[PDB]
Design a protein around this ligand. Structure first.
Ligand SMILES: Nc1ncnc2c1ncn2[C@@H]1O[C@H](COP(=O)(O)OP(=O)(O)O)[C@@H](O)[C@H]1O
Ligand SMILES: Nc1ncnc2c1ncn2[C@@H]1O[C@H](COP(=O)(O)OP(=O)(O)O)[C@@H](O)[C@H]1O
Ligand SMILES: [Mg+2]
Ligand SMILES: [Mg+2]
Lengths: 300, 300
């Protein structure tokens, strides 16, 4: 049930961006942290990624927990931060992004698990939380329907694609990126993978979920009060969960369609990862401090 | 593993159609049959339906076996016969058709089963076999993939919709009819319902399938040699199955993408129903004799 938070700077661009006050301190693998100072403000996520680090680098860290799902664990990955800061890239960049890398890492792990009596079934769903209203990105009423027993969570009338072939993954993925690149800015996209694997050998029925979330523009209709509502809620929910006496603390899971949606892949034995995508361009140090300040506090 | 065949006349129309040589003999519930003579040729399905009988009438007979799926049984329903003879009506006529009536009858049976500790899960798929090439009517590679163990049968990359709400059934159904009414003539549409219901009480895991098939125009590209290929194959497969020493007889299930597709919901403990939709218009007595002759022989 561990929470981790990583910062993630990206390289400047040609539209805007200059210099850099974003001093990324060297990763201190003793305290296990990794500070960084903006100008001077201090922050220290669970590992920082400067523009130099690539998706592969980023996923090599993550890959670790994401394979837990195959262990029936649940996982949440969040790409938070002002718009244009990279959230969709980190998540869906073709071949590279966390989602593409997850379906792969997971895929490979299974092929190699089959050989161990095991065997897995995989289906997923892609939806989006725009204005607290779930939309089915893979295709009405879509209400989060929980199962207090299995601790599962469905969503009514939501397309759930069987990730059977890589051709599918290809389509879905392709489609997912055409969708979140350049709306996608003012919403929360969510890729959900359901690892359901039996195993004749030990009959160890195993189920687990991964929720790869691309939060909406934390940047500074009235979906605006909304985005700040969800994002802030998530903040409070993560925080509250990453709190010592929290098992006994009252978390407002239902105070937002998102958190409520992933409340099960957010509790008990769950894995949550917050990615604070920030830009190095001094022309965003204002909205950047905010992002680093979101995580910094949320991670306690 | 019983096979039944019903004829099904429909009322004439304004485009064509006159009189009637289609003498429908009275249902003889002793021999259990029901002859009928065309002019004089004799035929005797498992019950005939003249234009007077409605979808409700037709389904009240069928409804019987279709509830078997809830008993883990598998079912196949075929609407065969020259084009314009009613196949799509019998199957998808709004609210009335066999498919709409099945999702209902099944739906009601479950609500009433839940109350008996039971509980069911339902998903379906709608695809079409046009030119031996499976198309996903609910949305690449679609290969029939069998499971010699569970006796199940998937179809790669094929959309499988969770029949969760009646809103969905509504959409799917609506969409299904826009699709097969006035192409749909030169193909085989197939609605597949998967009744998967556990039950905490007796933990009796139960799975069953229903395949509601709208065969292509048996009427008299080169999809033509194809349609005659599939239809004829199905003929031979039904026949061969409805044969005494058939358990020991070699059935060419794979000699057609359709039969091969439903080979499991066609054998062992399966329920197959053939519907020979014919017109009363003397202006089709030629292509009609053929239909009645298809069933007549196939049913032995
Ligand atoms: N890690 C990265 N490496 C290279 N370019 C990046 C990276 N992250 C973001 N970008 C670029 O920044 C721009 C913003 O894209 P996007 O990921 O959608 O940002 P955001 O999701 O924050 O709005 C894109 O042109 C993208 O290619
Ligand atoms: N049982 C029936 N009652 C009333 N009309 C029918 C019936 N069966 C078919 N029809 C009519 O016949 C026409 C042919 O429709 P369709 O069912 O698609 O036939 P087919 O599937 O054989 O091509 C339609 O206009 C339909 O409404
Ligand atoms: Mg974006
Ligand atoms: Mg038709």
């Amino acid at each position: 049930g561990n929470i981790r938070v990583y910062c993630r700077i990206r390289p400047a661009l040609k539209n805007l961006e200059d210099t850099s006050l974003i001093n990324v301190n060297e990763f201190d693998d003793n305290s296990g942290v990794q500070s960084m100072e903006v100008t001077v403000h201090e922050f220290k996520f669970d590992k920082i990624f400067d523009q130099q680090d690539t998706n592969v680098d980023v996923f090599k860290e993550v890959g670790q927990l994401v394979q837990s799902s195959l262990d029936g664990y649940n996982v949440c990955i969040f790409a938070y931060g002002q718009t244009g800061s990279g959230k969709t890239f980190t998540m869906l960049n073709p071949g590279d992004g966390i989602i593409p890398s997850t379906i792969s890492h997971i895929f490979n792990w299974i092929n190699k698990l089959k050989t161990k009596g095991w065997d897995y079934k995989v289906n997923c769903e892609f939806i989006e939380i725009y204005n607290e209203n779930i939309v089915d990105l893979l295709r009405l009423k879509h209400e989060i329907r929980h199962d207090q027993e299995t601790k599962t969570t469905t969503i009514t009338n939501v397309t759930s694609c069987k990730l059977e072939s890589e051709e599918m993954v290809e389509i879905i993925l392709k489609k997912a990126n055409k969708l979140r690149s350049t709306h996608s800015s003012r919403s929360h996209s969510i890729f959900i993978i359901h690892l359901s694997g039996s195993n004749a050998k030990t009959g160890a029925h195993s189920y687990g979920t991964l929720n790869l979330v691309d939060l909406a523009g934390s940047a500074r209709l009235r979906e605006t009060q909304n985005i700040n509502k969800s994002l802030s809620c998530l903040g409070d929910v993560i925080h509250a969960l990453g709190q010592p006496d929290s098992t006994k603390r009252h978390i407002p899971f239902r105070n937002s369609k998102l958190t409520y949606l992933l409340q099960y892949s957010l509790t008990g034995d769950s894995k949550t990862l917050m990615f604070v995508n920030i830009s190095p361009s001094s022309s965003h140090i204002n909205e950047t401090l905010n992002s680093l300040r979101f995580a910094s506090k949320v991670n306690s």
